[PDB]
C-alpha cells in the first residue's frame, strides 16, 4: 500500500545516503592544503562597448573567440567585434521580452527567446543581404530561460513549464522531452562532448540528463534555494553551481556528491552567473552586490575582485582559448577584461 | 586601414539608426494590469476593445497608452516581476462580489521594486455588493459596525488604504459596476498627475 511505498522510498534514500557517505574517505581541502597558492590576480578593463539602451540579460561568445552577441530588453540583439569594438549586425525583434541568447558553433545561426513561449532561429548568411527568421518553434507552455545549439540542425531548450525538450530546426517538432523537475528550470549547460547535459531547477536540486536515451541518470541536492546558474569543468567530470543562498558549490559526477563549498561571511548576495577558466583554476563568479570575485578553484580562497560595475551583473563567460573575460550588467555596458 | 574604413562606416550608420529608433520609441506610456481571475479585468479590457504577454495600444488625447496583461503566466511572481520595473503606473482591479485580493495588494505595495510606482484602484459590482449585503460581516469577522451599504463599502475602502506603508506612493480610487466606459477619463487624469509628480521629483524640486 501507500505505507509500503513510503517505506521503500525511505529505504532507497537511506541506501543512497549511506553509499554517498561511504565514498567520502577524505575531503578535497585536506589534499589541497599542501599545494602552493596563486597569490593575487589583478585585472583591468581593456574595452567598453556602449551601444544598448536598456538592461542586458545575456552575452555569448563566438566559436572563433572574436565575435560576441548581446541580447537586451530594448528589442535588439547586436553582434560585436571584440578586437575593434565594431557593430556588424543589428537584429530587431518582434517581442521586447527576451531573457536568453545563443550563438551557433558553426557561426551561421542565432537563437533568441523570452516570455512569449517561442524559440526563434535566425539566418546570418542569406544571399539577399538581410537576416531572416528561418523558423519559430512553439509548443512550450512556460517561459523559456535557456537554449543551446548542439549543432547546426538541433537545439535544446529549458522552459518554465518544468520541462526540457530537444528540438529539430529542420521540421520544428519536439523530438524528445525530459521530465522530473517540480519547479521552474532556470539554468542549462551541455558538456564539451555534447552527449550529456545538466540542468538546474528552482527547487534546490540539479539533475544530469542523457540526450540519446532521453532519461535522467543522477540527482544532486544540498542547496537551500533556487539555483540561477551552472557550468562545466573543462575536464567534463565536474560542475559548479551557484545558488541564491550566497554559496557556490562543486559537484563531482563520479563521486556522486559535493566536494567544496565557497562561502564568505562579508557576502550575502546571491550568485547570478558562474564560469570556470581554461585550465580549471579560477572560478570567476558574478554577484548581485555590484561586483565580481575570482575564487581559487582548489583552495577555496579569494584571489581578486573585478569591481567596476554600477549595478548587478547578469552574465559572465571566458573565451575558448582563455584569453579574455566578458561581463554585462543592468547598466547597459559590456566590458572586456583581460 | 585598407578596407576597414567601409566596416567603420557601416558600424557608425547602424549605431546612428539604433539611437534614432531608441529615442523615437520612448514616448509611449506603459501600464500593467493585475487582479484576481475574472474580477473585472475582462469588462475594462472589452470596454476599450482592441499564452504570453498580451499588449494593447490606443491613442487618447494625443497620449499613446500601452497596456500589458500577464494573467496567463501560471508561475511564481518573483521570477518575472522585476522585468516591469520601469512601468509608469500599475492598474489594479477588484470586484465586490466576494483576503484573496487584499493579500496580493499588500504584497505588491510592499515589494522592493515598486516603491515609487503608484497604484490606481478600481472597484466593481457595487449594486451587486448592495444586493449581497441585503441577502457583510462574514467576509470581515472583525468588522465592528452596522451592516449597511455605505459604511461597509467605506470601511473596506479604508482597509484598502491602510495597507500602504511607503509615503512616496499614492493610491487613488474609483467606483464602478462593470457597466460603464468612463474609465478612460480617470486613467488619463491619474496618469497625467503621476507624470507631473515623477518629472518634478526627477528635477529635484518636488
Amino acid at each position, epitope marked *: 500500500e501507500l505505507d509500503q511505498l513510503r517505506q521503500e522510498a525511505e529505504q532507497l534514500k537511506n541506501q543512497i545516503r549511506d553509499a554517498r557517505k561511504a565514498c567520502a574517505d577524505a575531503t578535497l581541502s585536506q589534499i589541497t592544503n599542501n599545494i602552493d597558492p596563486v597569490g593575487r590576480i589583478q585585472m583591468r578593463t581593456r574595452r567598453t562597448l556602449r551601444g544598448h539602451l536598456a538592461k542586458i540579460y545575456a552575452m555569448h561568445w563566438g566559436t572563433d573567440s*572574436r*565575435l560576441l552577441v548581446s541580447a537586451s530588453q530594448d528589442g535588439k540583439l547586436i553582434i560585436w*567585434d571584440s578586437y575593434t569594438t*565594431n557593430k*556588424v549586425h543589428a537584429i530587431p525583434l518582434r517581442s521586447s521580452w527576451v531573457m536568453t541568447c545563443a550563438y551557433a558553433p558553426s557561426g551561421n545561426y542565432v537563437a533568441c527567446g523570452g516570455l512569449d513561449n517561442i524559440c526563434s532561429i535566425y539566418n546570418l548568411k542569406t*544571399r*539577399e*543581404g*538581410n537576416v531572416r527568421v528561418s523558423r519559430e518553434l512553439a509548443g512550450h507552455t512556460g517561459y523559456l530561460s535557456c537554449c543551446r545549439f548542439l549543432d547546426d540542425n538541433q537545439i535544446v531548450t529549458s522552459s518554465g513549464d518544468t520541462t526540457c525538450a530537444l528540438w529539430d530546426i529542420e521540421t520544428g517538432q519536439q523530438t524528445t522531452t525530459f521530465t522530473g523537475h517540480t519547479g521552474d528550470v532556470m539554468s542549462l549547460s551541455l558538456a564539451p562532448d555534447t552527449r550529456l547535459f545538466v540542468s538546474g531547477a528552482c527547487d534546490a536540486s540539479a539533475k544530469l540528463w542523457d540526450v540519446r536515451e532521453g532519461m535522467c541518470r543522477q540527482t544532486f541536492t544540498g542547496h537551500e534555494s533556487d539555483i540561477n546558474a551552472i557550468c562545466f569543468f573543462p575536464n567534463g567530470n565536474a560542475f559548479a553551481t551557484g545558488s541564491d543562498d550566497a554559496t557556490c558549490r562543486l559537484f563531482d559526477l563520479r563521486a556522486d556528491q559535493e566536494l567544496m563549498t565557497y562561502s564568505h561571511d562579508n557576502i550575502i548576495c546571491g550568485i547570478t552567473s558562474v564560469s570556470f577558466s581554461k585550465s580549471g583554476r579560477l572560478l570567476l563568479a558574478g554577484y548581485d552586490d555590484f561586483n565580481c570575485n575570482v575564487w581559487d578553484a582548489l583552495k577555496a580562497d579569494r584571489a581578486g575582485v573585478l569591481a567596476g560595475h554600477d549595478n548587478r551583473v547578469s552574465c559572465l563567460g571566458v573565451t575558448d582559448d582563455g584569453m579574455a573575460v566578458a561581463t554585462g550588467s543592468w547598466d547597459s555596458f559590456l566590458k572586456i577584461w583581460n | 586601414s*585598407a*578596407e576597414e*574604413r*567601409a*566596416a567603420l*562606416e*557601416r558600424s557608425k*550608420a547602424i549605431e546612428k539608426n539604433l539611437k534614432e529608433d531608441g529615442i523615437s520609441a520612448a514616448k509611449d506610456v506603459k501600464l500593467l494590469l493585475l487582479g484576481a481571475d475574472n474580477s473585472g479585468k475582462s469588462t475594462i479590457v472589452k470596454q476599450m476593445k482592441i499564452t504570453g504577454i498580451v499588449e494593447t495600444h490606443f491613442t487618447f488625447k494625443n497620449l499613446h497608452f500601452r497596456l500589458f496583461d500577464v494573467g496567463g503566466q501560471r508561475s511564481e511572481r518573483k521570477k518575472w516581476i522585476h522585468c516591469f520595473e520601469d512601468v509608469t503606473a500599475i492598474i489594479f482591479c477588484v470586484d465586490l462580489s466576494d483576503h484573496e485580493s487584499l493579500m496580493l495588494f499588500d504584497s505588491i505595495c510592499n515589494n522592493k521594486f515598486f516603491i515609487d510606482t503608484s497604484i490606481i484602484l478600481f472597484l466593481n459590482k457595487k449594486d451587486l455588493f448592495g444586493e449581497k449585503i441585503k441577502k457583510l460581516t462574514i467576509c470581515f469577522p472583525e468588522y465592528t459596525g452596522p451592516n449597511t451599504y455605505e459604511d461597509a463599502a467605506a470601511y473596506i475602502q479604508a482597509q484598502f488604504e491602510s495597507k500602504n506603508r511607503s509615503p512616496n506612493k499614492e493610491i487613488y480610487c474609483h467606483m464602478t459596476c462593470a457597466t460603464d466606459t468612463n474609465n478612460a477619463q480617470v486613467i488619463f487624469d491619474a496618469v497625467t498627475d503621476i507624470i507631473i509628480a515623477n518629472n518634478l521629483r526627477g528635477c529635484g524640486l518636488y
Partner: single-chain antibody, 230 residues
Framework: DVQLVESGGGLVQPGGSRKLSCSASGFAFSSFGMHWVRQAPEKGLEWVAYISSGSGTIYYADTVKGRFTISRKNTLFLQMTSLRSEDTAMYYC??????????????WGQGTTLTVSGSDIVMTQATSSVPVTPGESVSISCRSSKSLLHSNGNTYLYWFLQRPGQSPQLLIYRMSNLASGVPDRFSGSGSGTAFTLTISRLEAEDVGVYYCMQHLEYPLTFGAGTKLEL
C-alpha cells in the same frame, strides 16, 4: 532569383554623351556597394568607378576623373560625357558588401556593349597562353610590385574566372578562401609576392581566362590574364 539587368549601350558619335543604368532586384540594394568595371574588345579588364553605401565615399580612376560621374528606386546610374576612342568596351556592374567575413565582388551583371567611331600596384602574369589537355593539373602564378600581406595578417589577392561568352565569376577571395558554389578543386596560396593557384583534375568547362586582382588601396589594377585554353 537575383538579377542585375542593365541597358543603355549603343553607337555614339565622338564627343557625345550617354547615360547607362544598372537595374537591380531580388536583394537589399539599399546596403550594397556598387562598382563599374569595363573591358576593351581585345585587352583585359580595367577599373572605372565606385560608389559606397549611402553615397558617403566616391573614387575614380586616373583617366576618368571629372569626365564620368557615378550616382544612385533600386537603380544605379553612371553619367558619361565627352566620349573618346578608348571608351569603347562592354561595361559590367558589380556589387560588393564589406564587413568582417564578407565576400566582395560576388555577383556580376551581363554588360552593355558601347562603341564609338608609380604609386599604382602593378600586377604581371608571364603565362599569357598555356596549352593544357583535359585530365591534367595546372598552375598559374601572379606576381606583384608591393607586398599585399598587411599587418592585420590578411592578403588582398583575388582570382577571377571568365568562361567564353559569359561574365566573370569569383573563385578565390583573399588568396585562401573559396567562394560559395565553387567546387573544392580550385585552391590558391602564396606569400608576400609570389602567388600561385592550383587546379586539380581539369575539366572541359574550366576553359577560359583567369585574372588577378588586388584590393590593398584604390585604384585597383587587374593582371594581364592567363588563357588556360584546351
Amino acid at each position: 532569383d537575383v538579377q542585375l539587368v542593365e541597358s543603355g549601350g549603343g553607337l555614339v558619335q565622338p564627343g557625345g554623351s550617354r547615360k547607362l543604368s544598372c537595374s537591380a532586384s531580388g536583394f537589399a540594394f539599399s546596403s550594397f556597394g556598387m562598382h563599374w568595371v569595363r573591358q576593351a574588345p581585345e585587352k583585359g579588364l580595367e577599373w572605372v568607378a565606385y560608389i559606397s553605401s549611402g553615397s558617403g565615399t566616391i573614387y575614380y580612376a586616373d583617366t576618368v576623373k571629372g569626365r564620368f560621374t557615378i550616382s544612385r528606386k533600386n537603380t544605379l546610374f553612371l553619367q558619361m560625357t565627352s566620349l573618346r576612342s578608348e571608351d569603347t568596351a562592354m561595361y559590367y556592374c558589380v556589387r560588393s558588401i564589406y564587413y568582417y567575413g564578407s565576400s566582395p565582388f560576388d555577383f556580376w551583371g551581363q554588360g552593355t556593349t558601347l562603341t564609338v567611331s608609380g604609386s599604382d600596384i602593378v600586377m604581371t602574369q608571364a603565362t599569357s597562353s598555356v596549352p593544357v589537355t583535359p585530365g591534367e593539373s595546372v598552375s598559374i602564378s601572379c606576381r606583384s610590385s608591393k607586398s599585399l600581406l598587411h599587418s592585420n595578417g590578411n592578403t588582398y589577392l583575388y582570382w577571377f574566372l571568365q568562361r567564353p561568352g559569359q561574365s566573370p565569376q569569383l573563385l578565390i577571395y583573399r588568396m585562401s578562401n573559396l567562394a560559395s558554389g565553387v567546387p573544392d578543386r580550385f585552391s590558391g596560396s602564396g606569400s608576400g609576392t609570389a602567388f600561385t593557384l592550383t587546379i586539380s583534375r581539369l575539366e572541359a568547362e574550366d576553359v577560359g581566362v583567369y585574372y588577378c586582382m588586388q584590393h590593398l588601396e584604390y585604384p585597383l589594377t587587374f593582371g594581364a590574364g592567363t588563357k588556360l585554353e584546351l
